[PDB]
Amino acid sequence: GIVEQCCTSICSLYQLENYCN
Amino acid sequence: GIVEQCCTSICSLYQLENYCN
Amino acid sequence: GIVEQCCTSICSLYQLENYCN
Amino acid sequence: GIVEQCCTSICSLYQLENYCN
Amino acid sequence: GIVEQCCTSICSLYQLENYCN
Amino acid sequence: GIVEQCCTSICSLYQLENYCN
Amino acid sequence: FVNQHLCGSHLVEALYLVCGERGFFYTPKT
Amino acid sequence: FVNQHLCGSHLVEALYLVCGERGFFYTPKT
Amino acid sequence: FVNQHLCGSHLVEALYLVCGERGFFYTPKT
Amino acid sequence: FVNQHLCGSHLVEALYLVCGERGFFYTPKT
Amino acid sequence: FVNQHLCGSHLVEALYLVCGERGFFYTPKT
Amino acid sequence: FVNQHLCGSHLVEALYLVCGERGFFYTPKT
Ligand SMILES: [Cl-]
Ligand SMILES: [Cl-]
Ligand SMILES: [Zn+2]
Ligand SMILES: [Zn+2]
């Protein structure tokens, strides 16, 4: 999930939107 | 400028992106 | 809601704890 | 102390109160 | 005190340095 | 540069001024 | 614990602290 | 933009920035 | 992305996020 | 609540949250 | 260094920076 | 004062504190 996508791995600002409501 | 504008009104991520080197 | 209430008045850690998954 | 309890090791919110005045 | 003074007026790093242990 | 001076290595507050405009 | 006055990202901060591993949902009005 | 490593309280800061008023779920269990 | 209201160090924060590896210049009026 | 790793500036954030108006000592030497 | 306008946890932040290893005492009025 | 490790968003916080109204360049490429 987000921690793997964004912390463990790297992620874009657009990916972080994946987690918007 | 960007600084005042984000703080006095509002501010798009896209405007901030003008301030990347 | 929680968001406005912490920022317009005040806000207990215990109320915030309702917002944990 | 706090750095060992809270950073090196893990600590609770209640433990962090230990360091309130 | 320091707390209110930084937040109600302004605050030098040098004043804050009085609050180091 | 700054990341080497300040993150990789350690730096002072006075050194961080090096990066003021 | 004392009561909080939390605005903007400082709310999400406090939420992060409070919720830790469970995480949380940040849900403002409009 | 970019991709950086976003962990913990910094992750939720970033979510706050990106999502804002849409709000978000921080669900570290996944 | 949503529009932002960013004051003080929260601007530099958002700038850090947005710019990442390129970094940025923080340049206020006076 | 939870137990997380709280280091450096994040530690003192958390102390700020928990203690608030009681205030706190951050004494890393111990 | 320039003068600061520091409210809430941004004070504790600045205090953290300034004091580093010595740490500090955060002591508000009431 | 002190020397600490200042990385990423914390680095730019610190630059913000030190520089303030002078502003700064964060240029991680160097
Ligand atoms: Cl604020
Ligand atoms: Cl970190
Ligand atoms: Zn703030
Ligand atoms: Zn951090």
Residue spans per domain, chain H:
1-30
Chains touching D (at least 3 CB pairs under 8 A) are G, J
CA-nearest residue to G11 within chain J is J17
A16 neighbors H14 (Cβ within 8 angstroms): yes
State the Cα–Cα distance between residues A8 and D2, nearest whole angstrom: 27
CB atoms J2 and G19 under 8 Å: yes
Q: Tell me how far the alpha carbon of residue K27 lies from the centroid of ligand 3, in angstroms.
A: 19
Chains touching C (at least 3 CB pairs under 8 A) are G, H, J
Q: Burial level of G21, CB count in 10 A (0-12/13-18/19+)? A: exposed
Say which residues have a Cβ less than 8 Å from residue F8's Cβ, sequence separation at least 6. none
The number of helices, as runs of H, and strands, as runs of E, in chain D is 2, 1
G13: closest CA among C7, E11, H4, B6?
C7
Question: Of the bound ligands, which one is closest to the alpha carbon of residue L9?
Answer: 4
Within 8 A of K21 by CB-CB distance, chain L residues are 2, 4
3-class DSSP string for chain H: CCEECCCCHHHHHHHHHHHHHHCEEECCCC
F20 neighbors L23 (Cβ within 8 angstroms): yes
User: Rg (Cα) of chain F, in Å, rounded?
Assistant: 8
